[PDB]
Amino acid sequence: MVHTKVVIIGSGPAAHTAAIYLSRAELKPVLYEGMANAAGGQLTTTTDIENFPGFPDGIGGAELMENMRKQSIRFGTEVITETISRVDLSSKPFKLWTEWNDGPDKEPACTADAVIIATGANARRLNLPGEETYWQNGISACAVCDGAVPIFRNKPLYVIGGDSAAEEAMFLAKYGSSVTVLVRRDKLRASKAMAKRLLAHPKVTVRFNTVATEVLGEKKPNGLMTHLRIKNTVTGEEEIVDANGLFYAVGHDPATALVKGQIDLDEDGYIITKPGTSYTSREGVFACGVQDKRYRQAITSAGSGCIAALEAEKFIAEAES
Amino acid sequence: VHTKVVIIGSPAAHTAAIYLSRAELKPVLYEGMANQLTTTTDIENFPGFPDGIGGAELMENMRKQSIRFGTEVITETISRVDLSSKPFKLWTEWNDGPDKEPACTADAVIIATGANARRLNLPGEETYWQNGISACAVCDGAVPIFRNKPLYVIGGGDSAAEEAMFLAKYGSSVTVLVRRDKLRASKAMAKRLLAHPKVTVRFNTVATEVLGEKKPNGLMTHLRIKNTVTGEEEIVDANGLFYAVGHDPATALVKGQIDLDEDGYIITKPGTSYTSREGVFACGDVQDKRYRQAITSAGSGCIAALEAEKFIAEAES
Numbered sequence: 001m002v003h004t005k006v007v008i009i010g011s012g013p014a015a016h017t018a019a020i021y022l023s024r025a026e027l028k029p030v031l032y033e034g035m036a037n038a039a040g041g042q043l044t045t046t047t048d049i050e051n052f053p054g055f056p057d058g059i060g061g062a063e064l065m066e067n068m069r070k071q072s073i074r075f076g077t078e079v080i081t082e083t084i085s086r087v088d089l090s091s092k093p094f095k096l097w098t099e100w101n102d103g104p105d106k107e108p109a110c111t112a113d114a115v116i117i118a119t120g121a122n123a124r125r126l127n128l129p130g131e132e133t134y135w136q137n138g139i140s141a142c143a144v145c146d147g148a149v150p151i152f153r154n155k156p157l158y159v160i161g162g163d164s165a166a167e168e169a170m171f172l173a174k175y176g177s178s179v180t181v182l183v184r185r186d187k188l189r190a191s192k193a194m195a196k197r198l199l200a201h202p203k204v205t206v207r208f209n210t211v212a213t214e215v216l217g218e219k220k221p222n223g224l225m226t227h228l229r230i231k232n233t234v235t236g237e238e239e240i241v242d243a244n245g246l247f248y249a250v251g252h253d254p255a256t257a258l259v260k261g262q263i264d265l266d267e268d269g270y271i272i273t274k275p276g277t278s279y280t281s282r283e284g285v286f287a288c289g290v291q292d293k294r295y296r297q298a299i300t301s302a303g304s305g306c307i308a309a310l311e312a313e314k315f316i317a318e319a320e321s
Numbered sequence: 322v323h324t325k326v327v328i329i330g331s332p333a334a335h336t337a338a339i340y341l342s343r344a345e346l347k348p349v350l351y352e353g354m355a356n357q358l359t360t361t362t363d364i365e366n367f368p369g370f371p372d373g374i375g376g377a378e379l380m381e382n383m384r385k386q387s388i389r390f391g392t393e394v395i396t397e398t399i400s401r402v403d404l405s406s407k408p409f410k411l412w413t414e415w416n417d418g419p420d421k422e423p424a425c426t427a428d429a430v431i432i433a434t435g436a437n438a439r440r441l442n443l444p445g446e447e448t449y450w451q452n453g454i455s456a457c458a459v460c461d462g463a464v465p466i467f468r469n470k471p472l473y474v475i476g477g478g479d480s481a482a483e484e485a486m487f488l489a490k491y492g493s494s495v496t497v498l499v500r501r502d503k504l505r506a507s508k509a510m511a512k513r514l515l516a517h518p519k520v521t522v523r524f525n526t527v528a529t530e531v532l533g534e535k536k537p538n539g540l541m542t543h544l545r546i547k548n549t550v551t552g553e554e555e556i557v558d559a560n561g562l563f564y565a566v567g568h569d570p571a572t573a574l575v576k577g578q579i580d581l582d583e584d585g586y587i588i589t590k591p592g593t594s595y596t597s598r599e600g601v602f603a604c605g606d607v608q609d610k611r612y613r614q615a616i617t618s619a620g621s622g623c624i625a626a627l628e629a630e631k632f633i634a635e636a637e638s
């Protein structure tokens with residue numbers, strides 16, 4: 001609003017959990033779920049989520065984020081579907097503008113004594129042909145999230161060069177019949193340990209200089225990905241192979257462009273906060289859910305969002321006189 | 322018997338077991354017939370359930386999910402554990418003799434035995450538990466049965482003052498019953514307390530009897546307190562009571578094998594589940610002290626599950 005108590009940025013699970021706790025505490029939090037730069041939590045793209053506690057028969061990420069939003073709005077979180085353009089973490093009240101409403105002379109869209117960050121760190125997508133067709137119907141980015149799906153059990157699994165690829169491929173090896181790793185360039189970017197225990201792992205091969213040209217599959221309602229046209233890049237040699245599952249592993253892009261140094265970041269881009277909390281490099285502003293790069297999960301993000309809400313309340317208690 | 326990774330405890334422990342069994346391991350989960358959300362009647366503070374879910378139903382859903390993904394859930398208490406050898410030895414309750422054999426040893430082990438808030442065993446506590454009584458205010462604060470109504474809190478530590486200053490955001494008048502003449506809390510916490518408008522502190526007073534509606538689904542209405550110095554008991558209008566004394570962490574089975582803090586909780590590398598001993602992880606309320614929440618507990622359990630998967634992968638290669 002004109003001046004709120006606390007503002008949370010992002011549509012993610014962390015943001016909605018923090019908003020649940022903050023609206024429970026009667027703190028009147030505002031939540032900016034944006035207009036990805038997806039609509040709703042970045043988890044909505046997942047067709048079904050079975051690794052979240054409390055849902056033994058799985059649950060669609062779309063309706064799960066819808067339920068979290070309904071919880072937040074029921075508790076009193078004023079959620080507005082607007083993207084945040086610019087932040088001003090310099091004045092004592094944190095001011096934030098809206099995309100297409102930004103301006104050096106334009107008044108801020110919302111100011112608050114504290115701001116929680118859960119803008120998400122969505123894994124990069126290759127925007128391949130067929131990706132928008134078989135998205136989460138055989139094409140994913142987290143192996144710990146879609147590895148146990150029966151459509152990948154004892155089936156050829158292909159993964160596109162950082163360590164984020166091997167950490168998931170040596171795990172997918174516990175399901176598919178043959179896991180193959182497609183590297184854009186010869187050799188492995190990852191440190192020597194994962195490459196050593198990966199090339200020596202018997203259920204996974206590493207095809208260097210090979211990138212997937214296109215993603216082929218069925219063409220029916222909820223059609224599954226069946227094959228992958230991959231192109232060896234030293235001979236321009238295109239070749240279509242059996243691939244029931246494709247897993248993206250290019251480096252995740254955390255949405256930390258708003259801070260631009262107001263809060264301080266790491267080399268990979270993520271927001272640096274104290275371990276096990278949400279206290280950023282600056283008081284008042286806390287980041288949760290952006291927070292993690294080693295686990296990259298929605299339950300951990302929800303826990304860190306609860307953490308951010310609790311620490312936000314703890315801080316608001318001290319600021320009030 | 323022998324398994325991949327053993328998980329001690331009954332939400333984070335279930336979350337760790339879900340993630341372990343999903344990764345196609347052999348994770349034995351020990352609920353124990355032993356030695357907490359199921360005590361909670363209704364839970365609105367959990368995400369994804371806007372209309373709320375009972376703690377018993379939530380834990381039953383988590384349990385059937387875990388046993389669906391492939392965890393050998395065994396309703397047996399773990400008594401003693403010998404973390405000396407490279408494989409970790411465990412022992413069942415009443416089956417933990419010094420010469421007795423380990424029930425289900427494993428290579429790695431997750432700890433999520435929780436940290437239970439101390440109860441008072443007052444007359445009627447069992448009768449009116451979670452129908453007015455509770456232990457976490459952040460969990461049962463915004464419940465409509467407490468808003469704009471008298472609330473009484475028992476405790477002497479900083480947690481009691483924090484819970485009272487949190488509950489002042491709903492009830493008409495919050496009262497705290499210190500068992501002694503002075504506050505065990507810090508000076509800043511006590512200053513923010515006594516300066517908080519809606520809180521009232523009564524020293525040398527312990528709640529003696531919880532007296533509410535003995536209706537088939539009755540709530541709590543009144544509380545017989547007593548000035549512990551004089552012994553003069555007095556029954557006051559208490560719509561909602563809150564245990565806010567210290568919490569007992571069920572780490573007793575570790576017994577110094579893993580480094581512990583002064584309050585008893587298992588120390589961990591911040592932001593992780595790693596313990597002092599490399600190979601055993603601790604998650605949930607055992608390693609969490611500032612939050613005590615079930616969602617944060619399940620998050621820490623997922624942390625422990627992923628780090629144990631990584632550790633058991635790095636061990637055999």
Ligand SMILES: Cc1cc2nc3c(=O)[nH]c(=O)nc-3n(C[C@H](O)[C@H](O)[C@H](O)COP(=O)(O)OP(=O)(O)OC[C@H]3O[C@@H](n4cnc5c(N)ncnc54)[C@H](O)[C@@H]3O)c2cc1C
Pocket residue numbers: 009010011012013014015032033034035036037038039040041042043045046048049050051052082083084085118119120121122123139140141142145146255258288289290296297298299301302
């Ligand atoms: C294909 C894929 C599949 C996955 N499957 C699973 C799974 O099955 N189970 C699981 O637990 N995890 C899964 N994950 C992990 C997923 O990223 C989780 O959502 C993440 O761990 C937690 O999300 P978050 O809290 O970081 O916020 P996010 O979910 O990433 O929320 C991002 C939101 O931030 C908003 N935003 C960004 N910038 C702004 C801004 N300036 N102003 C306003 N809003 C902004 C965007 O609108 C976007 O909606 C998957 C990830 C990917 C890429």
Ligand SMILES: Cc1cc2nc3c(=O)[nH]c(=O)nc-3n(C[C@H](O)[C@H](O)[C@H](O)COP(=O)(O)OP(=O)(O)OC[C@H]3O[C@@H](n4cnc5c(N)ncnc54)[C@H](O)[C@@H]3O)c2cc1C
Pocket residue numbers: 329330331332333334351352353355356357358360361363364365366367397398399400433434435436438451454455456457460461571574604605606607613614615616617618619
């Ligand atoms: C009245 C009350 C209300 C609450 N309401 C909420 C709420 O609304 N929302 C929320 O998020 N949190 C709530 N909580 C917090 C609650 O305690 C959470 O469930 C807690 O944070 C989770 O703890 P845990 O996962 O670490 O272990 P828990 O699952 O809570 O308990 C660990 C289990 O380990 C078992 N165990 C111990 N030793 C052994 C052994 N040797 N062998 C086998 N098993 C053993 C014990 O039987 C115990 O049940 C509430 C707590 C209380 C007291």
